[PDB]
Amino acid sequence: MQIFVKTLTGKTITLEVEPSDTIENAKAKIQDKEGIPPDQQRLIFAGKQLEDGRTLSDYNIQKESTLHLVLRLRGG
């Protein structure tokens, strides 16, 4: 199985994840794909922001769920 990760570009990344694919590990998977250091990686789900330490099983995330990916870059 696999879940979906949508970015501000509209690109939906599909990957395989387990209940130990915690935001910490998940951030690493995306990094190897986009090259964005976990520092610029922000996972949002249900308008709620996720924190490092909780697992997909803890947030009740499914194996097909859709995750919202956001990048940190302020300046205006």
Domain containing 5 equals 1-76
Q: Is 18 helix (H, G, I), strand (E, B) or coil?
A: coil
- Cα separations (Å) of 22 from 50, 60, 73, 76? 10, 12, 23, 32
Q: What phi and psi, each to the nearest 5 degrees, are found at residue 52?
A: -75, 125
54 DSSP β-pair partners: 52
Domain count across the chain: 1
The tokens of 49 are what? 């922001």
- Residue 45 and residue 68 in contact, taking contact as beta carbons nearer than 8 Å: yes
Give 5's Cβ-side CA count (13 Å radius).
21
